[model samples]
Target chain A: TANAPTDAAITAASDFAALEKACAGRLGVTLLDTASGRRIGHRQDERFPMCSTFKSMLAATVLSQAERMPALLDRRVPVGEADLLSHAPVTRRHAGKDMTVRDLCRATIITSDNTAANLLFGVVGGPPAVTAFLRASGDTVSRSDRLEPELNSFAKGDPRDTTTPAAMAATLQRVVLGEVLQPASRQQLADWLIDNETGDACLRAGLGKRWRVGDKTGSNGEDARNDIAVLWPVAGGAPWVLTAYLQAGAISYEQRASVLAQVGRIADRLIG
Target chain B: TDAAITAASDFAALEKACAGRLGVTLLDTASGRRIGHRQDERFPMCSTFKSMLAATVLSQAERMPALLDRRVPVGEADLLSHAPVTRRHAGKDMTVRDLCRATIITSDNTAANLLFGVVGGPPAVTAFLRASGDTVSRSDRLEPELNSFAKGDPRDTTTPAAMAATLQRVVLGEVLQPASRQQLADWLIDNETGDACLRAGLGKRWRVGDKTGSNGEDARNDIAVLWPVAGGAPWVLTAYLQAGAISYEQRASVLAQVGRIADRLIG
Candidate 1:
């Protein structure tokens, strides 16, 4: 069955242009086909900063690593004093909260917990490995040190960590199609990602409440707030991936919600 | 004062303990002094180049009042692209003040790129650095296609010594006017990230303000320590870690080294 609505059906729904005016800040949206992996509709892919949305790729990387060294996934590591030294407020709260490799991976996707991310980053062999994986996968975005293991903080909105909307959409497409990881691993990762508590509102707002969606959100400064989401219809239908990015917002939350609402509306009209 | 400065020696020991450790450098801000061991050679500043980007905006604000007051409207086309020129906003919504805050606090690439263009691009920034007596080399363009001065080749990077000197000027109000310096410092204090390296060394015992630069393959951790040294007036301390093969594992190792050194050096 065709995943995309007919061109006439798509054109009849309000175009992204009409939707953008209702939002207070800039927004970029992308809709993709699950089976064939084709771009259905897109608006602005270049300007938005790929905020914590990057955690999606991080999750993929972790899963890939787990596949290679399945034993590594079983490793249980303690949080060191040094780990809590920087970004102490959050890390201190998470200290002594022993986590397995799988738990760390889940924590990263669900909470976007910085401490959990740093721990997983180190265990997965640091940024270099992540960068290598991105390059190998042909992700053209520059990889910068946003998450410093010692500091337990991202470089804030460093462009070196920048990603394009198309690239992000492509990444999501691969993950959903089970191209990024094994079928079982992809299912597990997508389940955890869809359950991501932190980013739910941003990307899930546009979809039906009954539909299950997996996503991640990122925000820094006025120019860097974005969400990448995978949407599956609650009824019997194919799943779809969507990405939305916003830059220059007075408040990140308001802008994020507005963008999410727009994406959800688009999804409702197209997927239903 | 000597004992306080000497306390910094523990950093050396900390470095020895961590395998695959990268090099680190620390400077005494109050005395415009330095401690720790490294090549004293140049390395890519990575995103740390944003600090100079901030400095250049401050320099321009002195002559142009509109720079701070205008609001620059960011369009969908502008937001979607990461190209260096995409940052160039034509609308009034993007004020010079927004540029400064975005560049300093958030380290926004688009903001930095836009401000760099507004302030006459990278060539002007290099000239500004040279006129101030800081001998660091910088990228020539906002976004470099090749590994020329534009791409920030390690060959065209600045050393820890030059970085310290550049920061010293910013701290002392030598780079920009006193008012501009205060604003810059205030924005820097809001930097919620990168406090672990140099700020960790101070242990909440004192107030510290600084910037950090890092990439996947390189790490440039530097800071300006503002704390009391016994009888001396509240002074400044500085430390920078520039490593070639540095990884996330080496971050704590380097910070511990600097902390030990800072504890002694500023005692």
Candidate 2:
């Protein structure tokens, strides 16, 4: 019987060292073509602060729980105004109104709402629970150590709330490909990611209209700008994943975005 | 809005006329008018779930195009009680596309279960439904077990409102790609098994694409997407009836009444 492609086969076909050299060491990039089992990387194993991108996994944890406790998704939560935080685009709008767990998940993943991520940390039992979920899901290198705002602190030599580009890509592959979540939870997460409202200038723009991409993006002022995605060729081919983490880029956010977009162009050529 | 209110008020007469309890949900996507009498109420899905099951199969094919042509060998042991279609081709390799066709066009149990395997089983379909934004519906078992129809049992069932909404989303929305959506619509339109249910209601004036379910206990259900020959975007209607004393023919008559009411609402 045929089997899913293995890591050995994935690593043998790609030249990661050359790919890294091509990036000029400014970005950490890992592209895994799940269809052909080809893995390409530049500084894939190096740690980078995950920033807002961690919200996607945070939402996934809540979704995994919803499988057994189906009511969890529909439960209306009366979010306190005090619970709202900086950069809370989606959740802050519904001040007096109650938000369902599903809505919070959507806000956190789609709009990268900070208040929603904090609220979801409450639903899944804080940051340690997300870290535990990651460990249980076979990711040894990713860790969620703090809540948002504080979590965004990408201090030098500090490893809290950080993940290697390679590890995040593997975790995404597993979650999206029937490895960690129940089918419905998996689909719910994918649906939320596919409609993400935050990545227009990142992977989606870079990959252009030829590919269908579901992505979660993250950025920290002068620290990191990242986008992780599950992409499918619009024509017809197997789905693949890309994780682009930028640590040392030009000053402006647009310049940082352009760096990732250029990484997208390179990734397109490499995958081709 | 006035038409929707009138359609909903008209449903009260059908509710009183039927011997069994009827759950009817009519949703007009164009204007977003929704009428539900017991739409929140749950009813056993029985085989009507195969339509959604076929859509889930297409959802997987959106990412893995090979899924449509991937062949699975079916043998005697795979066939269940209501597997009229797959039983005929027992021992042959049926592609996932053919299985979806068999499941929809004939309501074949074996083909649906095989499709369940292709997509990852009962929970998978439930997940697909949830992920697609229909949170109130669920599928928990395969054939024979699913058809138990253990009165008022919540397992393996969909609320009429949720079913109607899901039908609109999967058939008329972007849950599936253009090609996959077209294929699902085509299969439902080509369906051979639903003639006595929703088909009997419309009476050939409208192009009715539908899926039907019966429990042989108390449930007779029909879920449909109807296109007017006069031309407009199609609308969805789902009617579920359950009663110990009502005959299948009588329940189907109630669905026909619901269909007529739907036509009048559109007119």
- Per-prediction DockQ, in order? 0.01, 0.02
Q: A266, model 1: CA deviation in Å?
A: 14
Model 2 lDDT tens row, B17-45: 55467898888878778877888988899
| Candidate No. with top DockQ | 2
lDDT of 1 at B28: 60
Quality of candidate 1 docking, DockQ? 0.01
Q: How well is candidate 2 docked (DockQ)?
A: 0.02
Cand. 1 Cα-lDDT: 0.59
How well is each residue in A17-63 modelled by candidate 2, as lDDT tens digits?
43233333346888998877778888788899999889889988898
lDDT of 1 by residue, A120-230 (tens): 778867767776777777666635345643222234354556666767777677665657678756766765665566664566765676565678877654445667787
Candidate 1 lDDT by residue in tens digits, B1-267 = 223323435645544444333344555655655664553655566556677777777787778744664445554344423322223332213555656665665455567666666788877888878877876656565532212222335543666667666776775657688766755665565465555566665654554556665544445455553544222334444344544444554563466456656666656
* Model 2 per-residue lDDT at B46: 87
